[PDB]
Design a protein around this ligand. Structure first.
Ligand SMILES: CCCCCCCCCCCCCCCCCC(=O)OC[C@H](COP(=O)([O-])OCC(O)COP(=O)([O-])OC[C@@H](COC(=O)CCCCCCCCCCCCCCCCC)OC(=O)CCCCCCCCCCCCCCCCC)OC(=O)CCCCCCCCCCCCCCCCC
Ligand SMILES: CCCCCCCCCCCCCCCCCC(=O)OC[C@H](COP(=O)([O-])OCC[N+](C)(C)C)OC(=O)CCCCCCCCCCCCCCCCC
Ligand SMILES: CCCCCCCCCCCCCCCCCC(=O)OC[C@H](COP(=O)([O-])OCC[N+](C)(C)C)OC(=O)CCCCCCCCCCCCCCCCC
Ligand SMILES: CCCCCCCCCCCCCCCCCC(=O)OC[C@H](COP(=O)(O)OCCN)OC(=O)CCCCCCCCCCCCCCCCC
Ligand SMILES: CCCCCCCCCCCCCCCCCC(=O)OC[C@H](COP(=O)(O)OCCN)OC(=O)CCCCCCCCCCCCCCCCC
Ligand SMILES: C/C=C(\C)[C@H](O)[C@H](C)/C=C(C)/C=C\C/C(C)=C/Cc1[nH]c(OC)c(OC)c(=O)c1C
Ligand code: SF4
Lengths: 80, 154, 171, 105, 115, 68, 98, 96, 318, 344, 112
């Protein structure tokens, strides 16, 4: 079959490139570590207002202000 | 139940295949005429088309028919020579070479060495002429036009 | 420019009417093209760009094939324009006149509720979001790839199987 | 439906974009979201014949939000009376409706 | 209205140009110059007759591929969604399905013309 | 010779350069020392309608600042 | 909006009247079907843009998809009809009564 | 290179959107009081217009419910001129 | 002032068409070992005006077999679309800022086909109809690849707006990421516009001037300048998309100048290609542009869908 | 047809209705109906003769219009209520247009003119599927909206279907049209009761399928398509006359056979709602539906017709065609009345 | 080079201003010539090129030859030769240019 592919790289190299690129497109997302930051970046974009929340008195991990320590630090997007 | 209207009704076939007047093959016809630039000079070329592919070609030549043979019958052997220059008009010296050879055979006479050598020389020059012509006109027809202008200088 | 949308709708009606009178498929395809253009324009008037552009593109690519076919199959010596038939011309004129009379009639028996010649252009857009972003048509269609992925598979199967259907009908 | 295969398996192939108050792609409300939500929350547990007359007020409010016919009638009446008065010479339109106001911001 | 204006301007340019082309020159009309060309000789029949098209299957599948374009074209907006896996799989499936259909047509000689 | 083509190319280039610089300068002239605003989303249109209604003259491109 | 919805429905009705009331050719009938499709598309799109129901906006693309597949198979049947009889007319298709 | 550049573009976008988020409240407040001003103006005109017709409540509703139903571009901008009506529609749709 | 802007966008494009005709003739000449026009002006810079004037003084042909309505309306449409295509072109600041510019271009061109395709039918004759059907085949061939190529290319730009490509190309060209898509786009712009080797509708040696054999005067001139305007448009599109010039917000005329340079290069490349190669066959064009370009196009679309994700390079929505 | 194509096409045929059932959106419902439409035409047009082309064109052109009308109804409902489901408080015009188009899809009178033609233009299979499986999703639409239909045209259409099916099958020598008019009549019986306990509509549907499928197999076993061809069955395969007789006498509903149960219980639930004289008319034209079945079974089972000399070759050779389901479906028809309370 | 002068060919006679009869005109090819001349849109000119077309030429006395295109199309300018040197045809084309240069049409229209 190596000989078959050797023949097909000479005769009909357009379909060889096509199948190679198809398989590469399907396989490379599985490989990279950067694949997961895509959804995270699409999530980080604030297209709509972050609606504030009522202080029940039981919201420690929720911040009281924008520039407090709590909340998702977006510094992973910096210096990615 | 036989009505007046269902009287002419005929029972269907057993294999559900009716016999028909198979429609006439009305191919389209086109004059690939003389003015057409691919018609190499004058060429009617009626051709039938089933779309854009050819089912029949009937070349109606007769548009550079003058009557050169009858005029030759009316002229001398020397007066008749330029007709051969004018028959194939891109390979001139070869046609008159043929005529000359024929008349020489009828006369039982041969030309000398130098004349034969310059005759074959100009025959091959005519070959290069007509091959330039044929190749470059074929290319013009197919779409490539630059060989024409490159070789017509030669 | 308040009667804009009503003019566009009336033109679309006339295009589809001249279609329904059925001249040769050449002028029928011309009518389809003009009517798809008008449709695109009103879909834009109501705040939609993508859907109109795609109606236009699809119907153009389709009427191309209709031309290629009707030159082969639905062709006659005399393709029967709208003017070719005095009867078709009469029904076309009568249809324009009848729809005009009908609009002027239903603008009387009901002051408003079906058609508003008086207030026209005042009821088109219905609560726009005056402050907004990521709001156009195209997000909703791109939902075919997320949150409505059954439309995508069912459409793709229609096309895929249609290829096989084409080959079998033609063989 | 006829064969509730979705409810059998808990999936939602099509039964999650059935109406307006249903998961717009980014959280943009469709108009009459509140009205349709209220109509639907009235007509739950009930089926049909009883909801059509115990949840009629909410459907009528929804129908007026979506089709919005009575407001057309109201504005058409106001406009007609205004045109009559202006033709008679009784009404005098103000600057903030002739095109000359002090814009607010 | 800017775009409407540009298009009206181009329209009126074209129409004024045709008006000039028709009403500026001189005319000498007669039946032997107003009849169809066909290369010096006369036509043997009408041009409003069947022209057999030999790529009709290719035309229809072009229509279906046009719809495939219409389905693929929302991708620039589909990519700014949070999932970015469902859209990936679904676009993969769509393109692969289209390629499979193209391959079936190719092998069954649908892209070849009806000789 | 081949340098006898440069005249036509030069007219062609001077003609293709004008549609850009002309549009830029017309924009700056009408809107005023400013690029013509792009409003691709309704938020930008809101900002411009606002700035129109702030001006005192129905023009979105006066840019009232901290003098208020 | 109510005006244009009325007009679009009347346009649908005209195209339906067309594809019902036949003439000689069949291609014209297929075009009337395409016109009905187009009017339905525009109705759906306008309702979706008015109501701001971006969840239903995948519906008209589906309409176009299936309508174009419909047109495709109709045109293939037309190819067969022409290969049989030669001239596209719907009056030659009168042999199943017997 | 494209990867890194689009990476930065997705950060400039974050900045712009964050500014939009910071200024949403002011625009919302002003939008609210502007709409309410326009509705009160419509009401104060409808009063003098339809003072005479027999049965007409001037601030009446078209809904059985009592909650806030936000108005629409025709109730608002209804009694106003045609330019405002034709810029509410066709204002963004026809780009600046 | 918008009308003055229309002038500054429309009249120079027409002079550019007129002198592109000259440049075509002279470049083909010098490639053909001859000098083109150098008589009527100093170096032949008046031959286009001469041709136009002479064409508008010739008597137009209204045949008997023709359908005069479509006959007169098709060149109108042709030029109108060729001249409306220049509208959203950012050079760098456009005349009309649309958010879906590429869809406007695509639809406008797919409608521009109908000029050929109705002029050929209306002109009741054989070679005319041959040219029309060849146009149908050509469009069937190229439209799919054009759209999916353009999709794959803008799948790293993030929008259909033409103006966003300038910021997409602030530090690089899209030719190095996508040279294959650029190749296929170039040859599809060559199949579009009916330009050699993909001419196949006025194929003077196959057909005797298809879809123009019955057109003589200013109508034929309109078709001519429509073609020679679409050429410059497509070169402008290639150089806005792939060969992104330098914006420099303070120096926008620099963008305009580099745009001019690249557009002239690519147009001269079209003329070069006319001079060099022979013509394809309109079935060989199908075989090429379905059995070589569409497989690789779909494969590279898959690639360009994967690529924003596995590289974390998803572009922004404005 | 190669196997990949058959897989694709039969999957599509199976998935049209299946999408139609397991879908709350009316639009995916429409999608399923269109899959049923698209995928049927290849196998209708498989033998490639003018009759098949005509049948396929008639089917396509009649079903496309009905599809567009259903889509109109759906879009008008979406405009009215902002949903993709026919609620109550919809417009009766929308609902009636939906009913009209669905009747055109099924084949009910006065929309019946295409079904016998199309059925004659296609083989015995593709008549079976067309008359049994294509009827199931269009019926599912009505079953899902039964308390919204007007109880007047629903009955006028049923009565017209009854009358016209009976009268049309009275004089059809072709069997492929007898089956069509039988379909028309039975869809009439179904649609009459559909606003009244639609479980009985599905009962009549299942009974009708179980009767028609083996009948089509019987016609298939010798490719019988005419009274004179089915009459040459006392020589070719004479072990089938018993089942053919009992199946025809179940189709034309006679008591001891289970094909009388649907008519009987339909009349019951119609007299429970004071729909008396309509049921009387229906029950009295079912007799004419029975008459031509009786004529047929005379011709084939009781008064053996002349045969040919060449039919002895068929006796020399052997057969394999009865699929072992003909027996089960013919015996579960014609002998399952005493189990009727478990059917209802 | 002719394109140096603005003289480029066009295949269709309707996109043409002149026809050059470069060859022998036969009785079988004369209707086609006249159809083509007719289809050419006025203003239009003719150049008879060669002895075979000026007159009958070397085939003057033959049965299938018209003894000049003068009898079928109106000729503006005659170019002699068998063949005429392209130098000479070019001279004749520039002479036709000079002929067009002195047409005086609008002058006489004003003087009508
Ligand atoms: C009642 C319907 C009557 C329809 C009239 C049919 C008819 O004309 O008879 C054929 C007759 C032709 O005569 P023939 O050539 O001697 O028949 C050849 C046999 O097929 C020759 O058949 P064979 O050589 O293969 O073997 C004889 C065959 C003979 O069996 C038969 O072929 C027919 C037997 C059916 C009997 C039904 C009587 C009613 C019973 C009431 C319950 O088998 C048997 O021995 C019968 C076994 C016991 C009965 C099995 C039947 C089970 C189904 C029950 C259905 C009951 C429905 C009522 O005419
Ligand atoms: C068209 C879109 C659908 C709109 C409804 C139809 C309204 C126009 C129909 C007018 C009748 C035309 C006709 O009968 O055919 C005559 C012609 C055929 O012409 P003809 O072949 O009969 O030649 C006529 C010869 N003379 C001029 C000497 C009388 O066909 C058409 O008019 C159709 C062309 C499109 C018509 C729309 C024009 C819009 C104007 C834009 C410029
Ligand atoms: C920038 C380049 C683009 C230019 C494109 C537009 C072309 C502009 C053309 C300007 C020149 C205008 C003169 C054209 C005259 C053509 C008609 C002609 O010469 O025939 C003689 C005509 C007709 O004269 P006549 O009445 O004696 O014709 C005689 C008729 N026969 C042949 C039967 C005996 O003369 C004129 O009419 C001149 C006045 C027309 C001016 C209109 C402007
Ligand atoms: C119900 C009333 C029926 C009245 C019949 C009127 C005759 C008619 O034109 O309808 C038939 C027509 C088919 O046309 P055709 O078969 O070719 O008739 C010969 C014309 N030369 O049908 C058609 O061509 C379609 C016409 C559709 C009408 C659209 C216009 C509606 C407004 C009036
Ligand atoms: C002989 C007769 C020949 C006639 C030839 C007609 C040529 C038509 C040219 C082809 C047009 C096809 C494409 C449709 C127009 C472009 C649609 C578009 O996307 O831009 C329209 C534009 C708003 O669209 P958008 O950019 O998305 O929104 C911007 C928000 N700031 O702004 C708009 O919404 C208004 C667009 C109006 C389009 C005018 C069409 C003129 C038709 C006149 C005939
Ligand atoms: C850019 C310029 C162009 C495309 C021009 O069209 C070209 C350069 C000019 C041409 C072709 C000149 C003359 C036309 C013609 C039709 C001649 C007749 C002819 N033609 C032949 O072959 C082609 C012959 O072959 C042996 C002949 O004997 C005869 C008698
Ligand atoms: S070269 Fe001489 S023989 Fe030939 S066509 Fe010319 S005049 Fe006649």
């Amino acid at each position: 079959i190596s000989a078959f592919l050797k023949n097909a790289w000479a005769k009909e190299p357009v379909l060889v490139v096509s199948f190679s690129v198809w398989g590469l497109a399907i396989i490379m997302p599985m490989i990279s570590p950067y694949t997961k930051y895509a959804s995270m970046i699409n999530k980080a974009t604030p297209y709509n207002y972050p609606v504030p929340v009522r202080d029940d008195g039981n919201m420690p991990d929720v911040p009281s202000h924008p520039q407090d320590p709590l909340g998702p630090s977006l510094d992973w997007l910096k210096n990615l | 139940y036989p009505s007046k209207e269902t009287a002419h009704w005929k029972p269907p076939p057993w294999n559900d295949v009716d016999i028909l007047k198979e429609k006439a093959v009305t191919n389209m016809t086109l004059n690939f005429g003389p003015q057409h630039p691919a018609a190499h000079g004058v060429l009617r070329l009626v051709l039938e088309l089933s779309g854009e592919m050819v089912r029949k070609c009937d070349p109606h030549i007769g548009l550079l028919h003058r009557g050169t043979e009858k005029l030759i019958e009316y002229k001398t052997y020397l007066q008749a020579l330029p007709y051969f220059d004018r028959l194939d008009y891109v390979s001139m010296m070869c046609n008159e070479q043929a005529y000359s050879i024929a008349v020489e055979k009828l006369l039982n006479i041969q030309p000398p060495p130098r004349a034969q050598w310059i005759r074959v020389l100009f025959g091959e020059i005519t070959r290069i002429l007509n091959h330039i012509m044929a190749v470059t006109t074929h290319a013009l027809d197919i779409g490539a036009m630059t060989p024409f202008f490159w070789m017509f200088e030669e | 420019m308040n009667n804009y949308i009503f003019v566009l709708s009336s033109l679309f009606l006339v295009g589809c009417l001249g279609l329904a009178l059925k001249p040769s498929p050449i002028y029928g395809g011309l009518g389809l093209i003009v009517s798809g253009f008008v449709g695109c324009l009103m879909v834009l008037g109501f705040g939609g760009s993508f859907l109109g552009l795609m109606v236009f593109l699809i119907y153009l690519g389709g009427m191309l094939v209709v031309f290629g076919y009707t030159t082969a199959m639905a062709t006659e010596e005399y393709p029967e324009t709208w003017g070719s038939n005095w009867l078709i011309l009469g029904f076309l004129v009568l249809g324009v006149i009848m729809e005009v009379f009908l609009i002027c009639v239903l603008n009387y028996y009901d002051e408003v509720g079906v058609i508003n010649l008086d207030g026209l252009g005042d009821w088109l857009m219905y609560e726009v979001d005056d402050v907004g972003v990521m709001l156009e048509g195209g997000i909703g269609v791109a939902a075919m790839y997320s949150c409505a992925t059954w439309m995508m598979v069912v459409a793709g199967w229609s096309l895929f199987a249609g290829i096989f259907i084409i080959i079998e009908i033609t063989r | 439906p006829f064969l509730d295969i979705q409810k059998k398996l808990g999936i939602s192939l099509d039964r999650h974009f059935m109406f307006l108050s249903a998961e717009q792609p980014y959280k943009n409300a469709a108009r009459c979201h509140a009205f349709e939500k209220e109509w639907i929350e009235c007509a739950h547990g009930i089926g049909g014949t009883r909801a059509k007359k115990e949840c009629k007020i909410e459907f009528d409010d929804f129908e007026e939000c979506l089709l919005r016919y009575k407001t057309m009638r109201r504005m058409h009446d106001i406009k007609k009376q205004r045109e009559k008065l202006m033709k008679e010479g009784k009404y005098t339109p103000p600057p903030h409706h002739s095109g000359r106001e002090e814009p607010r911001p | 209205m800017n775009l409407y204006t540009v298009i009206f301007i181009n329209i009126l340019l074209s129409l004024t140009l045709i008006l000039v082309a028709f009403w500026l020159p001189q005319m000498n009309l007669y039946s032997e110059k107003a009849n169809p060309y066909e290369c010096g000789f006369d036509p043997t029949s009408s041009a409003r007759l069947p022209f057999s098209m030999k790529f009709f299957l290719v035309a229809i599948t072009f229509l279906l591929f046009d719809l495939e374009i219409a389905l693929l074209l929302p991708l620039p907006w589909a990519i700014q969604t949070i999932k970015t896996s469902t859209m990936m799989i679904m676009a993969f499936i769509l393109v692969t399905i289209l390629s499979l259909g193209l391959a079936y047509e190719w092998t069954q000689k649908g892209l070849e013309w009806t000789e | 010779m081949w340098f006898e083509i440069l005249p036509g190319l030069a007219i062609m280039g001077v003609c293709l350069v004008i549609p850009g610089v002309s549009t830029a300068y017309i924009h700056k002239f009408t809107n005023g020392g400013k690029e013509k605003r792009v409003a691709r989303v309704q938020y930008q249109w809101y900002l411009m309608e606002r700035d129109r209604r702030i001006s005192g003259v129905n023009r979105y491109y006066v840019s009232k600042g901290l003098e208020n | 909006m109510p005006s244009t919805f009325f007009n679009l429905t009347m346009a649908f009705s005209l195209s339906l009247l067309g594809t019902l009331m036949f003439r000689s050719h069949l291609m014209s009938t297929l075009l009337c079907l395409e016109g009905m499709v187009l009017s339905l598309f525009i109705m759906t799109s306008v309702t979706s843009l008015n109501s701001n129901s971006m969840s239903s906006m995948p519906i008209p693309i589906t309409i176009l998809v299936f309508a174009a597949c419909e047109a495709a198979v109709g045109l293939a049947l037309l190819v067969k009809v022409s290969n049989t009889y030669g001239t596209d007319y719907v009056q030659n298709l009168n042999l199943l009564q017997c | 290179r494209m990867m890194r550049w689009n990476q930065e573009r997705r950060r400039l976008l974050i900045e712009d959107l964050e500014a939009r988020i910071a200024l949403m409240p002011l625009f919302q407040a002003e939008k609210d009081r502007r709409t309410l001003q326009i509705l009160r103006e419509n009401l104060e005109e409808e009063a003098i217009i339809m003072k005479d017709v027999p049965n007409w409540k001037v601030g009446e509703s078209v809904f059985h419910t009592t909650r806030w139903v936000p108005p629409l571009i025709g109730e608002m901008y209804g009694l106003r001129t045609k330019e405002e009506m034709s810029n509410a529609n066709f204002g963004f749709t026809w780009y600046t | 002032m918008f009308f003055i802007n229309i002038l500054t966008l429309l009249v120079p494009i027409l002079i550019a068409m007129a002198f592109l005709t000259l440049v075509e003739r002279k470049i083909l000449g010098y490639m053909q070992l001859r000098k083109g026009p150098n008589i009527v002006g100093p170096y032949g810079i008046l031959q286009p005006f001469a041709d136009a004037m002479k064409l508008f003084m010739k008597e137009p042909m209204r045949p008997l077999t023709t359908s005069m309505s479509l006959f007169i309306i098709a060149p109108t449409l042709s030029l109108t679309l060729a001249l409306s295509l220049w509208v959203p072109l950012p050079m760098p600041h456009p005349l009309i800022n649309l958010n879906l510019g590429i869809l406007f271009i695509l639809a406008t061109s797919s409608l521009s086909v109908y000029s050929i395709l109705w002029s050929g039918w209306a002109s009741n004759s054989k070679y005319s109809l041959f040219g029309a059907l060849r146009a149908v085949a050509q469009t069937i061939s190229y439209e799919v690849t054009m759209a999916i190529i353009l999709l794959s290319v803008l799948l790293m730009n993030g929008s259909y707006s033409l103006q966003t490509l300038i910021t997409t190309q602030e530090h690089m060209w899209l030719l190095l990421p996508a040279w294959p898509m650029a190749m296929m786009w170039f040859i599809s712009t060559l199949a579009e516009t009916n330009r050699a080797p993909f001419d196949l509708t006025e194929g003077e040696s196959e057909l005797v001037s298809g879809f123009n054999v019955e057109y003589a005067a200013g109508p034929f001139a309109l078709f001519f300048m429509a073609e020679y305007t679409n050429i410059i448009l497509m070169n402008a599109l290639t150089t806005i998309i792939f060969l992104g010039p330098l914006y420099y917000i303070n120096l926008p005329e620099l963008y305009s100048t580099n745009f001019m340079m690249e557009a002239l290069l690519l147009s001269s490349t079209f003329l070069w290609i006319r001079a060099s190669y022979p013509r394809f066959r309109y079935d060989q064009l199908m075989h090429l542009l379905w059995k070589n370009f569409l497989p690789l196009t779909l494969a590279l679309c898959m690639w360009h869908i994967s690529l924003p994700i596995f590289t974390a390079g998803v572009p922004p929505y404005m | 047809m190669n196997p990949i194509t058959l897989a694709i096409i039969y999957f599509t045929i199976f998935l049209g209705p299946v999408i139609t059932m397991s879908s709350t959106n009316l639009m995916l419902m429409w999608v399923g109906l269109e899959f049923s439409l698209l995928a049927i035409i290849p196998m209708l047009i498989n033998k490639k003769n003018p009759r098949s082309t005509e049948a396929a064109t008639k089917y396509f052109v009649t079903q496309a219009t009905a599809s567009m009308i259903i889509l109109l109804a759906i879009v008008l409902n979406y405009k009215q209520l902002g949903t993709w489901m026919f609620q109550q408080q919809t417009n009766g015009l929308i609902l009636n247009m939906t009913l009209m188009a669905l009747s055109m899809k099924l084949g009910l009178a006065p929309f019946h003119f295409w079904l016998p033609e199309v059925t004659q233009g296609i083989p015995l299979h593709m008549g079976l599927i067309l008359l049994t499986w294509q009827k199931i999703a269009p019926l599912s639409i009505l079953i899902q909206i039964y308390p919204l239909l007007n109880s007047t045209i629903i009955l006028m259409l049923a009565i017209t279907s009854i009358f016209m099916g009976a009268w049309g099958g009275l004089n059809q020598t072709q069997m492929r049209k007898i089956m069509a008019y039988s379909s028309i009549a039975h869809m009439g019986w179904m649609l009459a009761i559909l606003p009244y306990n639609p479980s009985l509509t599905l009962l009549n549907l299942m009974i009708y399928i179980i009767l028609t499928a083996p009948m089509f197999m019987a016609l298939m076993l010798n490719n019988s398509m005419t009274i004179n061809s089915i009459s040459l069955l006392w020589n070719k395969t004479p072990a089938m006359l018993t089942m053919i007789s009992l199946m025809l006498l179940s189709l034309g509903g006679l008591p001891p056979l289970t094909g009388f149960l649907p008519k009987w219980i339909i009349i019951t639930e119609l007299m429970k709602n004071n729909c008396l004289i309509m049921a009387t008319l229906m029950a009295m034209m079912a007799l004419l539906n029975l008459f031509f079945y009786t004529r047929l079974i005379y011709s084939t089972s009781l008064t053996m017709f002349p045969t040919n000399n060449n039919s002895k070759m068929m006796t020399h050779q052997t057969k394999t065609k009865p699929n072992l389901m003909f027996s089960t479906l013919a015996i579960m028809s014609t002998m399952t009345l005493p189990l009727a309370p478990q059917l209802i | 080079d002719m394109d140096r002068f603005g003289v480029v060919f066009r295949a269709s006679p309707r996109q043409a201003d002149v026809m050059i009869v470069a060859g022998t005109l036969t009785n079988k090819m004369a209707p086609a010539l006249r159809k083509v001349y007719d289809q050419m849109p006025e203003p239009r000119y003719v150049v008879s090129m060669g002895s075979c077309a000026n007159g009958g030429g070397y085939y003057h006395y033959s049965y299938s030859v018209v003894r000049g295109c003068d009898r079928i199309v109106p000729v503006d300018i005659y170019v002699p030769g068998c063949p005429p040197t392209a130098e000479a045809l070019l001279y004749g084309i520039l002479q036709l240019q000079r002929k067009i240069k002195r047409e005086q049409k609008l002058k006489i229209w004003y003087r009508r």
